[PDB]
Design a protein around this nucleic acid. Structure first.
Lengths: 129, 62, 141, 153, 150, 262, 103
RNA sequence: GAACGUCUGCCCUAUCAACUUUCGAUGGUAGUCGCCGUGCCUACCAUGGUGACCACGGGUGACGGGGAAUCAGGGUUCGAUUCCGGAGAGGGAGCCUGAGAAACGGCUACCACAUCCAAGGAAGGCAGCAGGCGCGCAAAUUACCCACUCCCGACCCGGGGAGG
RNA sequence: CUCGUAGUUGGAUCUUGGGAGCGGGCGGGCGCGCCCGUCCCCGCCCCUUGCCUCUCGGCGCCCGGGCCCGAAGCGUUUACUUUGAAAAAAUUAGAGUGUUCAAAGCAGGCCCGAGCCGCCUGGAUACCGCAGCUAGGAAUAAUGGAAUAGGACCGCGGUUCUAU
């Protein structure tokens, strides 16, 4: 079956981004990729965006900006034991000056700095730059 | 079974690529600047410095 | 294919083990054939008894006739061929004497220009050739 | 029930049932005692023991067992093997060489008192540990959860 | 997806996003329930019951007129059918396929459709097993091929 | 194993005795009674290095025969005995009387005691399964099957005998916020009001501890040892004040008192 | 020459717990006979733990109680009218637990 | 201390894919049994436990755990080898005494040996320290004290090729 | 080249939902208050998202009770992140530390004729997989509930009962 709209978002945005279109429309969506959109906004990589309502999939239009390089999707879905967090930081994302790996865990959505600040780790799903 | 001691370490650390004479430029300028006995001391200083610096550094990131 | 799920180890580790079964650096040290057919049972030394002394051909590019001895192993008993270094050092060798031969250095394989020779001599009359030529000792010849 | 005819005779010896000559104190009129060893960690005497003559020397609601050491549970799978059941405790192993998991399960053997019946496939049974009973059965059945269709009445 | 067919096309439907009541001829819930019961009563299948209710009365969705749908309200009535739509239609084309093959045995490349027929009915049979509109065991080895066929 | 062993090793011994790596391989083992190997003191090493009386063991064995030293109100013929936490030893030739009690960390800190306070020892209750003749008689972890205690004591209290085997005196009862000194475990040197006790079914009971300095934690039941009811333990606490000052803090006090004032 | 063994038995799946050690005195299977009625004969046996326990050879009388009044006397085992495991111990006249006697 | 015990991990292997058994492999019942639990063990019963989730079968220079050479985090090669466990006592088998023993630095067989001797008979077991002999490329000394350490006694009054 | 058992996996959605919420911790104009920061981050909250129904009582608070408690969190469940018990000393990562360097060692120093019948307090933490245990968490994963009707006020109990 069709799978992993998170991965499909992280592929469609990078499909259109190097082609330079100002906004983008993606057929499927989820509240959690919405949540990645919001984490992305708190750093400002993307701008504001619109959530086209069609109960069938839910489409998203989101603006692409020169604040971005790429964000990865990791299936299988691991867990950061809060020992391995620094390891994952140093071996996936290109910079400690920007970009901060993403975690779904028992304290809300978050990126790895804010995760370390609340002292709770969990699954890796995203890492951006 | 014995009751003697057991402890030893390494001090004259091996050169990881001695075949260019440039690390030897370093090795011969060490005697050109302080004229001591052999290069066991070269390697001992390079071990001690690395150990101290790294003892600080690998603990830094935590 | 190339699958990447999580709990997959029942496929992952066993397929990886099976696909490991292709390296020489795996075969040559993980099935009995390597040990049980190395020309000796495994030793940096190969003491034995010389049974004759002869010359070995070379290939015509580097034409040569090098000095090689048939050693009769003691640890097993078979026969092996080993060249002798230290120019002049074949005339000394008195056969039927317990000698040291180590593999030709190429670790289960041989050098080219003297084919068939995967062994080389150090001891004769229990006296090294690396001492025979340099003269710090001498054989009881 | 018509249980009194195993290859010995069994009863409860605490309060004597033969203490009255007329057959009103014996099995007779008012049933003899049936001592319940002190049961706990949430456990008590359900229907079965009171409603029936369901004695066993290795029963967990009676008998000389001591539920200690660890306390676990499992699933009801194969209903052969009179008075003994086999249960799968399916877990998934975790590895460190690889950062992924593996699958491996250990099957458990438990005796189940004649108290519990109408046991059907696919539910939960909670289990305890007591004195070693035999080679395989080192455990004891306590509760049975699901013995009906999945989504109706 | 899409194994049992090599084509990928889809043209099914995309109902009006506006979940509002149709409102061309309203024809409210009363006669709708009457027609639904009549259609199920005389021996009809929900797939074509819906087609008739869209044709004559006119419906985009029965859930729109009334919260309970055709299967739900039949199940609350008592008129549950013999076997469901996906087992039954494939069975009643399998009968034709097997008639074909055993009348023209040489058709080596229609056994390749018969086999997917036991496969499709096998998939949906072990599905409706868990759906429990079929008994806990339901046996099709082509031994159930014509039990319901007179 | 076919039969009990007789030789214990240097390295195998507990580390709280300053284990040594060049002397030998073997060990001074005790005579296997209360206050076991993990929680004992070979009195031979006590006289050997702990006060360093006799340089080597060849002389340490002599004070027992010289009959200046006694163990637990009774003569000593063995230079060692199973003896651990709360052990009174009264050297009446230099006047040095010791309790063997635990340090900030559990080193059997050198404690000097008044023999008046030493006479009445505090003993923990092991259990009362129920006494013979319908009359209970309690047991202690120092191995005192004491007859006739007070007729209200529940387990995990502590009795107060005078090195004697009769009836007893003022006794503690384990309840909220009453002082404790662990027997083993990792909570040595952390003494405080209990403030809470998870008597939780399904596992081994646990005792919360609100420290005398603030730090709150929880210990296994068996570890905690009653030392004082209310807010005062009658057991005297040695240098270290019954609180293990942090290794982070100990930097100044291991260095301006050792190698700076001596 | 008789002594109990558990690891001697086959494993759960038809394997065999191979030997690894030497057969010890912890595991005993001491051999004897079954004590019928006759001349009183007993012997002590030195067993695990240095303890010594009483193995019978023959005996006639013991302590037989009454439940409905709870009073014991010392009567005679003339015979054995039933044993609860095999049909011939009746005649064999062993003396075992829950042995049934007409006395 | 010593076994019995609850969950959970072993290396390769499908040119091992259906096995385990009345000769207990599956449990119950009853009874002997040894310290008990238990087919430890015998009968009458129900003929069962397991694996395509790798059982059954195998084979391993299978000694195992802490750890060594390495090694950006990955992992890789191992760890007879002073700590511990389990082990065996030239190889099995069988046993009194002993708290603890199936004790071979108690024996009794047997194995294959070979110690003697004036042949009627007897009578032995270094994988302890030394070593020899054999092997092999390969590992130390018939030096003493138990002065460190211990460890032993009826016990600071004596004993140690443990250790030094 | 098709099918298909395990085989590993998997649409959307079933709260990331509002307040000026308050004390406290903050980015920030202002001087943590007004606040922008989907309750910026929690104890106390408010529209909701679980429980004292039960005993004696804690400042409460009312008149033996009750809004919360307890010994204590008993109305599904698991996966998985944050708490401690455990991780046999020790090889070590290893603090303090002249072994005259360096390794080595848990060591010493300070004194005076000791003349005081002395002093300092040391001889530290951490890691110790997986799994066994302990408390939080409820974002992600699974699973779970009243569809031909029953979860609740002892609904009114005919009926058979069985103590205190």
């Amino acid at each position: 079956v069709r799978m992993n709209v998170l991965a499909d978002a992280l592929k469609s945005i990078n499909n259109a981004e190097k082609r330079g279109k100002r906004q983008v429309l993606i057929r499927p969506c989820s509240k959690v990729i919405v949540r990645f959109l919001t984490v992305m906004m708190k750093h400002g990589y993307i701008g504001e965006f619109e959530i086209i309502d069609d109960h069938r999939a839910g489409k998203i239009v989101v603006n692409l900006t020169g604040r971005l390089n790429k964000c990865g999707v990791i299936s299988p879905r691991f867990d950061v034991q809060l020992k391995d967090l620094e390891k994952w930081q140093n071996n996936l994302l290109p910079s400690r000056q920007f970009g901060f790996i993403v975690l779904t865990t028992s304290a809300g959505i978050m990126d790895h700095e804010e995760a370390r600040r609340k002292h709770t780790g969990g699954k890796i799903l995203g890492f951006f730059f | 079974p014995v009751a003697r001691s057991w402890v030893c370490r390494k001090t004259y650390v091996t050169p990881r690529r001695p075949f260019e004479k440039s690390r030897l430029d370093q090795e011969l300028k060490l005697i050109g600047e302080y004229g001591l006995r052999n290069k066991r001391e070269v390697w001992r200083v390079k071990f001690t410095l690395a150990k101290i610096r790294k003892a600080a550094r690998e603990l830094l990131t935590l | 294919g190339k699958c990447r799920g999580l709990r997959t180890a029942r496929k992952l580790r066993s397929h990886r083990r099976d696909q490991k079964w292709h390296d020489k650096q795996y075969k040559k040290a993980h099935l009995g054939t390597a040990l049980k057919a190395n020309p000796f049972g495994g030793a940096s030394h190969a003491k034995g008894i010389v049974l004759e002394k002869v010359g070995v051909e070379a290939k015509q590019p580097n034409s040569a006739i090098r000095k090689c001895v048939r050693v009769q192993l003691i640890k097993n008993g078979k026969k092996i061929t080993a060249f002798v270094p230290n120019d002049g050092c074949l005339n000394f060798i008195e056969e039927n004497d317990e000698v040291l031969v180590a593999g030709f250095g190429r670790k289960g394989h041989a050098v080219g220009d003297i084919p068939g020779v995967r062994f080389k001599v150090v001891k004769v009359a229990n006296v090294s050739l690396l001492a025979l030529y340099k003269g710090k000792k001498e054989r009881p010849r | 029930a018509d249980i009194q005819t195993e290859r010995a005779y069994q009863k409860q010896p605490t309060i004597f049932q033969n203490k009255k000559r007329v057959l009103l104190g014996e099995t007779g009129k008012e049933k003899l005692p049936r001592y319940y060893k002190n049961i706990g960690l949430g456990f008590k005497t359900p229907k079965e023991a009171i409603e029936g003559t369901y004695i066993d020397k290795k029963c967990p609601f009676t008998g000389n067992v001591s539920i200690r050491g660890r306390i676990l549970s499992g699933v009801v799978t194969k209903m052969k093997m009179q008075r003994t059941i086999v249960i799968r405790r399916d877990y998934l192993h975790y590895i460190r060489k690889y950062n992924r998991f593996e699958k491996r399960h250990k099957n458990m053997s438990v005796h189940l008192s004649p108290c519990f019946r109408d046991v059907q496939i696919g539910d939960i049974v909670t289990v305890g540990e007591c004195r070693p009973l035999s080679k395989t059965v080192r455990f004891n059945v306590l509760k049975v959860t699901k013995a009906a269709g999945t989504k109706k009445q | 997806g899409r194994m049992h067919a090599p084509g990928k096309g889809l043209s099914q439907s995309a109902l009006p996003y506006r979940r509002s009541v149709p409102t061309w001829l309203k024809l409210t819930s009363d006669d709708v329930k009457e027609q639904i019961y009549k259609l199920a009563k005389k021996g009809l299948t929900p797939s074509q019951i819906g087609v008739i209710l869209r044709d004559s009365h006119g419906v985009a969705q029965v859930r729109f007129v009334t919260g309970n749908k055709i299967l739900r309200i039949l199940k609350s009535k008592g008129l549950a059918p013999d076997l469901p739509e996906d087992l039954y239609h494939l069975i009643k084309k399998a009968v034709a396929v097997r008639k074909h093959l055993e009348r023209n045995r040489k058709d080596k490349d229609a056994k390749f459709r018969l086999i997917l027929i036991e496969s499709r009915i096998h998939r949906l049979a072990r599905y409706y097993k868990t759906k429990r509109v079929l008994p806990p065991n339901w046996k099709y080895e082509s031994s159930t091929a014509s039990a319901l066929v007179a | 194993a076919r039969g009990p062993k007789k030789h214990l090793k240097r390295v195998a011994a507990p580390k709280h005795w300053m284990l040594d790596k060049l002397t030998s391989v073997f060990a001074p083992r005790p005579s296997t009674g209360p206050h076991k190997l993990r929680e004992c003191l070979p009195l031979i090493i006590f006289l050997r290095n702990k006060l360093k009386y006799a340089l080597t063991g060849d002389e340490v064995k002599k004070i027992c025969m010289q009959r200046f030293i006694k163990i637990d109100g009774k003569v000593r013929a063995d230079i060692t005995y199973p003896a651990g936490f709360m052990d009174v030893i009264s050297i009446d030739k230099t006047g040095e009387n010791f309790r063997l009690i635990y340090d900030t960390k559990g080193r059997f800190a050198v404690h000097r005691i008044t023999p008046e306070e030493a006479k009445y020892k505090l003993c923990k209750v092991r259990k009362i399964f129920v006494g013979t003749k319908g009359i209970p008689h309690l047991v202690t972890h120092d191995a005192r099957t004491i007859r006739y205690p007070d007729p209200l004591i529940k387990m995990n209290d502590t009795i107060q005998i005078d090195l004697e085997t009769g009836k007893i005196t003022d006794f503690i009862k384990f309840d909220t916020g009453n002082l404790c000194m662990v027997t083993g475990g990792a909570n040595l040197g952390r003494i405080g009001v209990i403030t809470n006790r998870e008597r939780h079914p399904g596992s081994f009971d646990v005792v919360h501890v609100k420290d005398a300095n603030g730090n709150s934690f929880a210990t296994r039941l068996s570890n905690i040892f009653v030392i004082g009811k209310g807010n005062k333990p009658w057991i005297s606490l040695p240098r270290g004040k019954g609180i293990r000052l942090t290794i982070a803090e100990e930097r100044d006090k291991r260095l301006a008192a050792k190698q700076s004032s001596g | 020459g008789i002594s109990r063994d558990n690891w001697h038995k086959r494993r759960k799946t038809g394997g065999k717990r191979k030997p690894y050690h030497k057969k010890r005195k912890y595991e005993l299977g001491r051999p004897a006979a079954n004590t019928k009625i006759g001349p009183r004969r007993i012997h002590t046996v030195r067993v695990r733990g240095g303890n010594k326990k009483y193995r019978a050879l023959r005996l006639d009388v013991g302590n037989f109680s009454w439940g409905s009044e709870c009073c014991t006397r010392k009567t005679r085992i003339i015979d054995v009218v039933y044993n609860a495991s095999n049909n011939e111990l009746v005649r064999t006249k062993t003396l075992v637990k829950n042995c049934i006697v007409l006395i």
